[PDB]
Every structure is written in C-alpha cells, then in structure tokens.
Design a protein around this ligand. Structure first.
Ligand SMILES: Brc1ccc(Oc2c(Br)cc(Br)cc2Br)c(Br)c1
Length: 1182
C-alpha cells in the first residue's frame, strides 16, 4: 500500500541514464509503431492482387494479354512492398537493440548505486535503530527488494511504452482507415471481457471446493496416520481404508462435476470469442459489397485494432512490474534518507589529544528501546579516576552492562551526562571516541578471514610485528603458533572452531592493537572454562595498567585487585569503595560474596491407467478431429479473402461469403462439441485413476509396520502431503497436457499437408524458416536462465559479506571499521556491475535477433509467394492459406514447450508413488498366514530379548530381558526410566521383532504366529488415548472389528469402564460425537472410553501403559478404580508410574539396562533393599 514518488525512484539517474531512458523509450515507441504499419502494407498487397484478381477472371477471352499488364503491376507493386518489408525488419532490428540495451544499462548503473548507498545507510544507523528491528528481514530486504526495483526500472518500461505505442498506433490506423469497423470491433469487446470474467469467478470458487473436497478425505488420513499405532493395534486397517475410499468416491464425483462444467465453460467461452471476431469480419464483408471499403482495407483495420486491443493486455504486466518496484523502493529509500543523531560516519566533534582518561557519570537516567515499559537506570552517580580500574557488581538487571553501553555512546542517555575527561562525550567525534575505547565482550566474535586480518580489524595500518607483539602481549602467541598455517589460519562460524578462551584472547589482541586510553571489559571471563579463564585473565590484567578501565563480571576473583568496587540496586548506585570497606559495610557486595562462597520411463503408471481402455480413445480421436478442425478455419478465412480476391465478376461473391460464414459457424459448433468431449473424457479418466492411486497408496501405507512410521523422513504431515501431491501430479500428465499435445500435432499435421499440397515449395520454405525462429526462440531463453543463475551466484557472495557485517553489527560498530565493510561490499559488487553491463548488450542482441528473424521471415513469405510462385500459375488465395495454416500450426506447437515441466513434475511425483506401493514390510498385518491357535488361556514369556530401535541403533533399550507371567495375574513393571518399561508392550503387540532372543505367549513364538490374530487378543491402553471423530459407541466398537458390536455389548463395556455417567448424561448419549470436532471432554473420560474399547475386545491380556500418566486429583482415583477392576480377571501388564497402585500386583519387576534386575511380590522386594525400595521410598516421601 505504501509507494514512492516517481521522480525520487530515479534520483540516482543523471546525465546519461536520463538520456538512455529517452533514446530507449523513443526507440521503444518506434518499435511498437512498426507492427501495425507492417499490417497496413498487408492491405495494399491485397489490393494489388485484388485488382489483378478481379481483372484476371474478368477476361475469359484473352490469356497472353493477362501475362503482361497483370504481371507488370505485380512486379512493381510486390517489389515495392517487399522493399518496404525488408526496411521494417532492419528498423526493428535496430530499435529493438536500442530498446532493451539502454534500459538495462540504466537499470544496472542505478541498481549498483542503490545497492552501495543502501548498504552504506544500513551501517550508518545507530544501535537503538537495530534494537527495534529484525536484522534478518533487513538483509533479505537488501537482496530481494533491490531486485524488485531492478525489475521495475529495467527493460519492462521499454516494453510498456512499446505496447502503448502499438495500442495507440493500432487504434489510430484503426480509426483513420475507417471509423465504422473499429466501433463495430470495440462493440464486441465487452463480451470477450465478460466471458473471461466468468472464468475468474468459476476458477476461484471451484478451486476452493476441491481444496475443500479432499480436505474431507485428507482429514480422515490425518486422524488415521496420526493415530496409526492405535488402528494398527486394533486392526481397523480395513475400515480406515474403507472410510478413505468412501470420501475418495465423493471427491471423484465432485471432480467429474467440475470437469463437466469447466469444459462447458471453456468451450462456450471460445465459441463466443471466435463468433465475436467472425462477425466483425463478416460485417467487414457487408461493407465491401457496398463498395464502402476495399477488401484489403478490411484486413488493415481489422488486424491493427485487434493488435492494439491486445497490446493493452500485454502492457498490463509491466505496469505492475513498475508499481511493485516503486513500492519496493519506499522502505529502501527510507533507510537511505533516514539520518542518525549519532552517525559515526560524521566528521565532526572534538578529537582530544593527551586523554588522561578521567571518566564520570552524572545523574544518568536511561532506558533501552523497550522504553516506558521499563526504566533500568533511575538516577546514577559514578566517577572513575585515570589509571584506576573500577568494578561493577550487581544481583541482576545487568544495569552493570548498560554503563559500558552508554560509554561507547551506542545510546545517548535520557537525562544526565557521560563525561570522558572534562568534556561531554557528545562533543567528541563518535568514531574517534570509539577509537580511544577498547572493548572485550562476553561472547567474542571473529570475522571470517585470517587471524592477522581479525587483528587487523583493530587497525587497518599494522604490520605482522605489531600483530605479533599484540598476541604475545595477550599471551595468545604460544597457542596460535602451534596451530598450522601460522597467522594465515581461518576462523568463523564455518571452519576452525576454537576454544572460547582462545577466541577471547584473539579478541583481547584485536582490542590491544587499538591502543585505547579507555578499556571496557564486560563479563569477558564469564561463560568460560575455569582453566582457560586464568589464561585470559592474565592477559586482561596485562591489558590494563596502561589504561583507565571499567569492568563488569560475576567473577569476584578478578574484582579484588580493582582500585574501586561499585554495587547497584535498582539502577541506583549504592555501595562503593575498596573490597575491605565493602565487606565492613556488610551490604549488597558482602551478601553476594557469602552467597557465591529419478526421471525414467515409467509406463506401468499408464498400465494402471489402462483400467480404462476407452475414454482415452474417445478423447484422442475426438482431439485429433479438433486438431484437423482448427486449420479449416484458416482455409475458410483464406477462401473468404480468397474467393473475394479471386472474385472476378462481382454478382456471385455476395452469395458465397454468406455460405462461407455460415459454414464457419457450423464448424465452430462442431468444434465446441468435440472440445467438451476431449475435455470431459480425459477429466473423468483422470479423476478415477486419482481414486485408484490414492486408494492403492493409502492401502500400501497401512501395510507397513511401526518401524516405517517411526522414521523422521515419514511424519503424518509429510505423508498426507506425499499422498496428495503425487496423485494430483500424475493426473495432470495424463490430463489436459496430453489431450492438447495430440490436438496440436494433429493441428500442425492437418495444416501442413493442406499447405504442402497446395503450395509446392511454398510450404517447404516456411518449414525451413519456422523451426529456426522457434529454436532461436528457445536458445534465447536458455541464455536468459544462464545469465540469471550466474548473477544470482555472484551477488550472493556480496550479500554473504553483508550478512556477516549486519548480523555481527553491534560488534563491528564497536570496533568502527564500518568503512571497511563498505569497501568490501563495494568491491564484491563491482563484478556483477561489469556483468550487468554485458547483460544489456546480450539481452538486446538476442531480442533484436528474434524480432528480426520474424520480420525477415515475413518478407520471405510473400516475396516467394509472389514472384517465383505467382509469376507461375500458383495463386495468392493459397499463399494466405499457408501463411495462416503453418504459422498457427507452429504456435500450437508452442504449447508443447509450455506443458513440458508438467510432465517432469509428474514423473518425479510418479517416481515416489510407484515405489511407495511396492515397498513391503517385515511384519505385514495383511498376510493371512499364521496359526490362529484354538486354546484360550494366556501366558507370556520374554526370553533373552535384545532390542534396539530401528531409528536409533546406538543406545540399546533391551539387553537380555526375560519375563514370565501366568494367566489371570498382574505383572507389574518398574524401571529406572525409558521405554525399557514400554518396549515390552510394543513387542507383545509385535510392532517389532526383537534383534535376538524371543517372546512367546502360549508357548508359541509370536514370530511364527499370525500377526493380526496375535494383536486381536491384546488389551492395549496407552497414555494419551486418541479417539477418532465419530459416535463414542463407535470409538468403543473400534475395540472389536471383523464384526459389528452390539449396543448392549458396548454398553456393558462403558458400564465396565465406569464412563456411563457421561454417556447417559449427554443429550445424544452414545451417539454423541467426540474428537474435538463434534464435542470436547477431558482426558479421564477419553481414557475410560479407551478402557471400554480395550475390554469390548474381551482380551485375555490387558496392557496398561502409564495409563494414569496425564491425569489429576479424583480423576486418577476413578480411572485407576476402573483399571483395577479391568485386570485380575485377565493376564495383565501394568507399567503404571504409580507404585502405590502397583503395591497389589502378583509380581513386580524392576528393569535395569534392559536386563531384569529385581523381581518379586511387593513385600518381597520391600524385604530386600535396593532399586524397588528406593523407587517406593522416593515418591512416597516426595
Ligand atoms: Br469466416 C472466418 C474464419 C476465420 C477467422 O479468423 C480465424 C482464424 Br484465420 C483462425 C482461427 Br483458429 C480462428 C479464427 Br475466428 C475469421 Br476473422 C473469419
């Protein structure tokens, strides 16, 4: 919404840039003007053939006589027109180069300047300005917005003016050569504007419906694939597929409905558009029979106007290009034009010599940019004498840290003054002030360059001698020399990551080359390892003694030797003095002392699509007819102008034109009828295989075993996404693109034959010319993408050293050396500039070439069409025919190149989808194999089990685990931590087979047992029960599948679980809808429901996995009261973390390191003393 003055935007264009734009825009208008002229001549060529076309047939007496006057007229005329044509082509060749080159030149020249100025502006902002802003956004704002600006002031303007030139130029010629047809042509404009308006309403409204339509299915898929382990446990994999299939079934119906309507729309629209012209032209005929117009003039106006008419449309994008570029320039120039109070690029203010370094802080009230919300310094008084070293101590607020902030004048204070020597800080030059102050900060930063270079950021003029003394005076010499490459090493976020204590010591060296008279050390020892801390501390102590210093840390080791110590409470300076005095004060300081002590041929996807042998042949046959039908319109048009040009005696013409125009409208209706067909057939044929594919994928997906679903690669979202995209994308490829690709090859084919047989060698020529301009049209785009990628690569290097400068900014400014990064940025940019210059010459040449190639190619159409061909008996009516036929047949091939990516994007999306079906699991629930034992009573043996999770085969969970539990008794399971407790239940559900060892139930190894039948006997109840959205009766009935469960049966289970209070309490009762769509309830009820479905199954085995995990107060007491009633009739395993409620358990088992450690009945483990005793003691105590 905000935008910029048109004149400010160009403020960096002067002298030449203004001229370039003037010559370019000029040439741009000449260029535009060229096309409607070219069409004007196409009238005069017509009148020439038309005068001879009328007189030639008017004879029917003399022959040789017509070999004289006619041919002479054609000779002089055609040569004239051809000469002019060759003229225009040269014209466009020149202006088209001038157009793009100059504008791109201006663009480059300015954007270079914009970029430099912009970065300079970023570095000039004071810190309070950064504190309030997001640096990341600002950098992305550096690289993206300047690009928008460049796009707008680029050759797009030239294009705009070329377009307006064709539009004006079109409608002028439109009006002068006649006022009638133009008005008649504008008259039909609203209709075309109106039909394409139905499209923006249909598309936008229906696009949501499908996104709404599948949103119902992909919801199923989301609550399923999220709940997977549950549906896997309860084996609802047949139902959860059935549901998805039932929503898919609707989606396809809506999908076919859309297919019907959208094609009706497209067809009807097209028919309106073509009827609309055909009337303008037939109206154009009605005025020729009246001898009001010439048959060539009808052309001249009818072309010029439609050209100019569409030229409006072709300009519209460049308007947007420019506008966006204005709006993009607003926030950029706002930084450039913003001026700081502080600067630091300013040359102003005193520069004292012989600074003795006497500092004082007077009544300083300050607040950081968070402003009125907080005031962190309320008053203040502090002096520090020259050569002394003062220490600042405090509990919190780090108002300590603020004084170091004010002393570099990063912020100016609200009220009060900071005084270096006698003078107010604000009277001294900012840069020089920063140059007389050294700084060592808590988190040290090193820019990416050599150590010498980072030290060279202390001062730009320095020699390895001074570097050496500096690092040796920081005692950083010894440790870096050992490092390879010596001072030439690397540092940064990338490469050569070092000890912090070494980084700080390079930082102290950097600070030391500064030879500052004032030192600020903030926390520099804090957040550092104890051993190296002393190493650095020594350097700090050696860094002072030449200087006056203020230091802030939480280390009261370094403070003692400070000449003065200062405490803060609430921004108010409170205690000051030598250490001893402060202790004698027994105040804040003392208190703190005591406290701290693969693209490939995939046919099989089409083989799946072969489920329909028909609906393809229908569409294809139907589309090829449509292909053959298109050029016939050109044939008509050719003979409408043809017979009319070839007329001879005028009486017969008027009756014929009617016949033709009638036929054409019979063809348009036959075209509509074929088009809707080729649309609908493919559409339905797409929508059904969409179902088949999504079905088979979703089916194969429920086949895989928990091992797969654990993968970081596959998460619920990524799968729904993979599920939608891949299925849409293959529909696309077998969809419209193919129908069209066949319609068009048919269109060129049926055109090329007609043309070829009519014109001998006329066509053969056009087929030499067209492919070359096409290819030449492609190579340009290749070069374009090439240059684009290259420049992207090059400005990226610069933006990288920008990112460094502005992300680490508060440090660079502390060191000054902003001019450094300015210069570096500048040098970096210099390559894309010299590049951007070449870009213009290239862009220009390619464009001009592809225009010229078209105009000269036009000259060849007629010069050969006349002369050699029309000096022969071969005729004009045909030359027109072949012009249109071939030239359109080609432009229909233009659609091939456009649908090219739709195929690739589809095959890649097929690539995964054919694999996701074919992948098979280790444990497949689908295998009907497995024993299905007849004997009821459950036992469970875990023997010698070693298990590692497939995702994390590093730290093992189970190593040599062994358990046994008899029927009808509870096995309590305790652990130090982890899924060691929980993995048991997973393995009994056979989510996994163990690596080594084995687990039996009835004495049969489950590994050889039927996977499904196994899980069918299991009473799984987990931490967070996931309930699908549906009647709670169904969430319960989920407990048993392969059969519909009785109402009284799901009642009994809700009676069991103690959930009945709710289920009767509700208005709907058992038909109420749950899952946070229809209704919401707390976890206790959800759980009791999960308990209900657990024992609807009438399992022989409950599995209670930390069932009380999320729960509170009486809710626990009631759920536990349900679980406790659920077991004791069954084999049970309870890993519950309430050991108070495990006290009554037939066996308790303590898991340690995946081995069982302790086991026995409660009092039996209580009789011992060890892990379980410690477990029951700790949380009974706490
Ligand atoms: Br009759 C008659 C036939 C084609 C005409 O222009 C074309 C041409 Br030429 C080609 C196609 Br495809 C569609 C139309 Br509409 C006109 Br104007 C009148």
């Amino acid at each position: 919404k905000p935008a910029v003055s048109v004149l400010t935007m160009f403020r960096y264009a002067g002298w030449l840039d203004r001229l370039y734009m003037l010559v370019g825009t000029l040439a741009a208008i000449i260029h535009g003007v060229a096309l409607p002229l070219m069409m004007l001549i196409f009238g005069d060529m017509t009148d020439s053939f038309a005068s001879v076309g009328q007189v030639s047939k008017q004879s029917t007496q003399m022959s040789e006589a017509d070999k004289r006057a006619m041919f002479a007229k054609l000779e002089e005329e055609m040569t004239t027109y051809a000469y002019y044509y060759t003229g225009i082509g040269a014209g466009v060749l020149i202006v088209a180069y001038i157009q793009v080159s100059f504008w791109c030149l201006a663009a480059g020249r300015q954007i270079h300047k914009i970029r430099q100025k912009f970065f300079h502006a970023i570095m000039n902002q004071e810190i309070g300005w950064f504190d309030v802003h997001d640096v990341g956004e600002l950098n992305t704002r550096l690289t993206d917005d300047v690009s928008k600006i460049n796009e707008g002031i680029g050759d797009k303007i030239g294009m705009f003016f070329q377009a307006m030139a064709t539009f004006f130029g079109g409608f002028i010629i439109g009006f002068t050569r006649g006022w009638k047809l133009t008005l008649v042509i504008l008259a039909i404009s609203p209709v075309l504007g109106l039909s394409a308006g139905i499209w923006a309403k249909i598309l936008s409204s229906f696009t949501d419906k499908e996104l709404h339509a599948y949103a119902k299915a992909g919801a199923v898929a989301e609550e399923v694939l999220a709940a997977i382990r549950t549906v896997i446990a309860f084996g609802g994999q047949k139902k959860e597929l059935e549901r998805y299939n039932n929503n898919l079934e609707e989606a396809k119906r809506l999908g076919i409905k859309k297919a019907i309507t959208a094609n009706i729309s497209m067809g009807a629209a097209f028919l309106l558009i073509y009827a609309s012209y055909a009337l303008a032209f037939w109206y154009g005929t009605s005025l020729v029979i009246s001898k009001e117009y010439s048959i060539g003039q009808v052309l001249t106006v009818f072309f010029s106007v439609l050209i100019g008419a569409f030229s409006v449309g072709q300009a519209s994008p460049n308007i947007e290009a420019f506008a966006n570029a204005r709006g993009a320039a607003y926030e950029v120039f706002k930084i450039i034009d913003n001026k700081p109070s502080i600067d630091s690029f300013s040359k102003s203010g005193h520069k004292p010599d012989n600074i003795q370094g006497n500092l004082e802080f007077k009544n300083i009230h300050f607040s950081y940019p968070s402003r009125k919300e907080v005031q962190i310094l309320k008053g203040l008084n502090l002096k520090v004498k020259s050569g002394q070293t003062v220490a600042l101590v405090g509990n919190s607020g780090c108002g300590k840290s603020t004084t170091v902030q004010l002393m570099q004048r990063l912020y100016d204070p609200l009220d009060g003054m900071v005084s270096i020597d006698g003078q107010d800080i604000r009277t001294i030059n900012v840069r020089y002030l920063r140059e007389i102050i050294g700084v060592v900060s808590q988190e040290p930063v090193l820019f990416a360059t050599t150590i010498a270079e980072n030290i060279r950021y202390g001062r730009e003029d320095v020699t390895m001698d001074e570097i050496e003394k500096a690092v040796k005076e920081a005692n950083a010499y010894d440790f870096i020399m050992k490092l390879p490459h010596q001072f030439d090493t690397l540092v940064g976020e990338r490469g050569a990551q070092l000890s912090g204590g070494q980084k700080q010591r390079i930082a102290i060296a950097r600070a030391l080359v500064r030879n500052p008279k004032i030192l600020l050390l903030d926390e520099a020892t804090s957040a550092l390892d104890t051993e190296s801390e002393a190493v650095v501390q020594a350097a700090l102590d050696k860094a002072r003694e030449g200087r006056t210093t203020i230091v802030i840390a939480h280390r009261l080791s370094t403070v003692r030797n400070a000449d003065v110590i200062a405490g803060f409470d609430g921004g108010v300076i409170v205690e000051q003095g030598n250490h001893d005095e402060l202790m004698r004060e027994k105040g804040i300081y003392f208190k703190l002392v005591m406290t701290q002590t693969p693209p490939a041929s995939f046919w099989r996807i089409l083989k799946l699509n072969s489920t329909e042998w028909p609906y393809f042949v229908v569409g294809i046959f139907c589309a090829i007819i449509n292909g053959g039908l298109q050029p016939a319109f050109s044939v008509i048009f050719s003979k409408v102008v043809g017979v009319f040009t070839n007329g001879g005696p005028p009486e017969t013409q008027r009756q014929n034109s009617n016949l033709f125009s009638l036929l054409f409208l019979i063809l348009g209706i036959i075209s509509f009828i074929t088009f809707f067909l080729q649309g609908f057939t493919f559409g339905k044929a797409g929508e059904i295989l969409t179902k088949r594919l999504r079905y088979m994928v979703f089916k194969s997906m429920l086949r895989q075993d928990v091992s797969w679903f654990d993968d970081p690669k596959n998460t619920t979202g990524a799968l729904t996404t993979r599920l939608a995209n891949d299925a849409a994308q293959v529909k696309g490829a077998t969809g419209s693109r193919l129908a069209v690709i066949f319609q068009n090859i048919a269109n060129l084919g049926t055109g090329i034959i007609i043309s070829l047989i009519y014109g001998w060698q006329l066509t053969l020529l056009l087929l030499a010319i067209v492919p070359i301009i096409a290819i030449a049209g492609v190579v340009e785009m290749k070069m374009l993408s090439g240059q684009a990628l290259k420049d992207k690569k090059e400005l990226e290097g610069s933006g990288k050293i920008a990112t460094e400068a502005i992300e680490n900014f508060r440090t660079v400014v502390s060191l000054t050396r902003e001019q450094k990064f300015e210069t570096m940025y500048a040098q970096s940019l210099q390559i894309p500039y010299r590049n951007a210059m070449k870009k213009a010459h290239v862009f220009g040449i390619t464009f001009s070439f592809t225009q010229a190639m078209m105009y000269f190619s036009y000259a060849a159409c007629f010069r050969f069409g006349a002369y050699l061909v029309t000096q022969q008996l071969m005729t004009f009516e045909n030359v027109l025919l072949v012009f249109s036929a071939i030239v359109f047949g080609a432009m229909a091939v233009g659609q091939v190149s456009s649908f090219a990516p739709d195929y690739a994007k589809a095959t890649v999306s097929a690539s995964h989808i054919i694999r996701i079906i074919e992948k098979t699991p280790e444990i497949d629930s689908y295998s009907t194999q497995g024993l299905k034992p007849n004997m009821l009573e459950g036992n469970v043996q875990f023997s010698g089990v070693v298990f590692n999770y497939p995702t994390r085969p590093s730290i093992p969970v189970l190593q040599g685990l062994s358990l046994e539990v008899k029927k009808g008794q509870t096995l309590a399971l305790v652990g130090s931590s982890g899924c060691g407790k929980s993995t048991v239940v997973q393995l009994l559900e056979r989510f996994y087979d163990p690596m080594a060892g084995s687990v039996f139930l009835d004495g049969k190894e489950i590994k050889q047992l039927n996977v499904q039948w196994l899980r069918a006997q299991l009473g799984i109840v987990s931490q967070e029960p996931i309930l699908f959205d549906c009647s709670i009766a169904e969430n319960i009935a989920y407990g048993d599948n392969s059969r519909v469960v009785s109402y009284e049966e799901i009642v009994r289970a809700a009676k069991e679980a103690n959930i009945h209070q709710f289920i009767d309490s509700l208005p709907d009762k058992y038909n109420t809808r749950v899952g946070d769509k229809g209704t919401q309830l707390s976890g206790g009820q959800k759980q009791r429901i999960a308990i209900a479905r657990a024992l609807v199954r009438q399992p022989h085995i409950l599995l209670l996995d930390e069932a009380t995990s999320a729960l509170d107060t009486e809710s626990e007491k009631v759920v536990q009261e349900a679980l406790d009633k659920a077991r004791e009739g069954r084999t049970c395993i309870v890993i519950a973390h309430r050991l108070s409620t495990i006290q009554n358990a037939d066996l308790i088992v303590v898991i340690q390191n995946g081995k069982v450690k302790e086991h026995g009945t409660h009092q039996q483990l209580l009789a011992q003393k060890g892990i379980y005793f410690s477990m029951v003691s700790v949380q009974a105590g706490a």
